[PDB]
Amino acid sequence: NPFSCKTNVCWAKALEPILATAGIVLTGCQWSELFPQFADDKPHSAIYALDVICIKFFGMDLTSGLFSKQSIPLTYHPADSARPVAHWDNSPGTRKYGYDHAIAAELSRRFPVFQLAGKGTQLDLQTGRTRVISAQHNLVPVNRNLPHALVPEYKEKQPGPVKKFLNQFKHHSVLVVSEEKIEAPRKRIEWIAPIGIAGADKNYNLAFGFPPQARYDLVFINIGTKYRNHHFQQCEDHAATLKTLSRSALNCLNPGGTLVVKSYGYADRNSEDVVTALARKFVRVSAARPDCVSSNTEMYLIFRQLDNSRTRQFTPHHLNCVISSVYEGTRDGVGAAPSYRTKRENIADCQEEAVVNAANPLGRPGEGVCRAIYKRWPTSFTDSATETGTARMTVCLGKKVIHAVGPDFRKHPEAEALKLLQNAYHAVADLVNEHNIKSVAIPLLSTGIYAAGKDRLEVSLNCLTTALDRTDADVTIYCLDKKWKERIDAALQLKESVTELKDEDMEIDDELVWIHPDSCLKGRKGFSTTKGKLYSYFEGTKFHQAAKDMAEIKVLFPNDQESNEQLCAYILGETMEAIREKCPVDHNPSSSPPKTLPCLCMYAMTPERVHRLRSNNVKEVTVCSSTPLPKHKIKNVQKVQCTKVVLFNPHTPAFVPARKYI
Ligand SMILES: [Zn+2]
16 A cells, blocks of 8 residues: 555545556555655645656656546546545546557557556666666656756755845845745845744745735745756656745735746746746746855746736747756846836947847848948848848847848738737847847837838837847837837836736646637637647647647758648648658657647647648648748648737747757
8 A cells, every 4th residue: 555654645546547557556665756745745736746657657748648548537626615625536527647558559669668568667768678667767758848958967056145146136025935044134034934944934834835924026935846866857846846835925926026936947847837827927037046056956937027917928938048048057147127228319329239120121221220220330231131020140340230120011911910020029039038138229110111101109119028028138229209209118117017916816727728719629628718828739639649740840840931831741641751751860759839829810720720621631721821831832722811810939939859868
């Protein structure tokens, strides 16, 4: 009996029969060796545990589909009039799991060990060997594209004074959850500590979180997790902690408030799902590794200005870039807060690190800010040409000139144009992040001429901030006419002030997936038309295979347009093996989750739509403008405009192939 003398293991007990379908039967020592939470008898997420167990035995995470056979329900029960506390069991529900032999069978082509291994053994996918399950092996899932880099070797350090870090936040009174006292005489500190710690203002059992305190403008969660065998593993062990303490902190946080919480990054899928749900509630989120960290894997996440929004569309492009660069030494980072400003001056005279030109596709000089930029930095126009909806980095002596090309509204329908405008701004943001640009001078794209005789200030500005909230840069908007400056200042003052919540429900739903409105998954638990995460493999549904294949095609053809062309081929037949041959090189075992909401129109290319088309063996397909294709024409593919679009970053978030750490 593995559960002997353990008061909170219901999560493990609940997994037991699901593990059985895969031939896995864990002993008590094995449970303890795998989960510190089990060994220390603490509450935990059965789902997170299942992901960890899958990686440990099969060397891949749950997006592989290995446990996605719908057999045994895994059901979470919140406390209610019947149940004093939340509980995990196998009672009936729409969420089910079990070992999928079909998935294992297709996997056995590259990983024969699946077919040849015995039951209940840990698989080494590379060497092809097996062993009794061990927490020290299969440390990274081979099928995952990591959102950010990991540290090669764990090194502990002596932390500096935390006061230097807390002083970077403008708030006087701070709620502090920490195991060790924090000295900040310049602050008023309420100190919450775990149970055995003397000198604290409050003590709770932090494995269970903490009940609501008063509300603060700054909450600082300093609670860490013990390193064992690997960075990825540390993220795994920390994930439930991160969610629990973050959730408790949300009860203690005022609107417009800031939450700083210690993390190791979000390397594992669960950590990323959590950080994403959490991030959806804030205007901005960044990261820092100040001098007060105790190890090289420690990373403080900074969530700024809580409005607890529902429909906010968050993508980890920015955060991935930041965290990864910090771990690789390329960046600082630290918690000073980016800001917007306006200048009525000539942009050519800007003092900001980079200046953005409002450009045209041909990269030629023209009237506008572009006149000033050409006269002062002519050689930046040597090769400036870039397509509409994109931006190109060039340098003239000591200055970065980014040529961003907005849409001409006379030449495009309003929805498609809007998408292009947003994309130009996102590209500016991509460059700012990639080059760690500290300040940027930028005009309002498509408001001068390309505006087509109408006033685009509000919408151009909205695209600007939508994109540039996703950087760490200080932004200076240069403009035009005193009246336009008046209006921009007004909009910015409105935006910077968050005095109240947009919703009062503070739960962090890390499972929820945001789906297209015409999806047949509408109404199903775990999916929503109005909110949730923007990427999924749809494992556990019939769209999983379609999702995996789209993902792989994107791995084989990193260029968005070449990728979508091959996807068109795939919709029409040609299967996968053929496309893999069409690719010159070694395949990566890993991919990234396809976006679930590329557009709102009827042609949106979801794993769902791909599956419906391919299962109907259509002789032709229609593709909208939100699924970019090569400029030439493709047989049996009709190109049409997208009538309703989405404004978040369309690119695959940057990643590190897990294979690197394997
Ligand atoms: Zn569309």
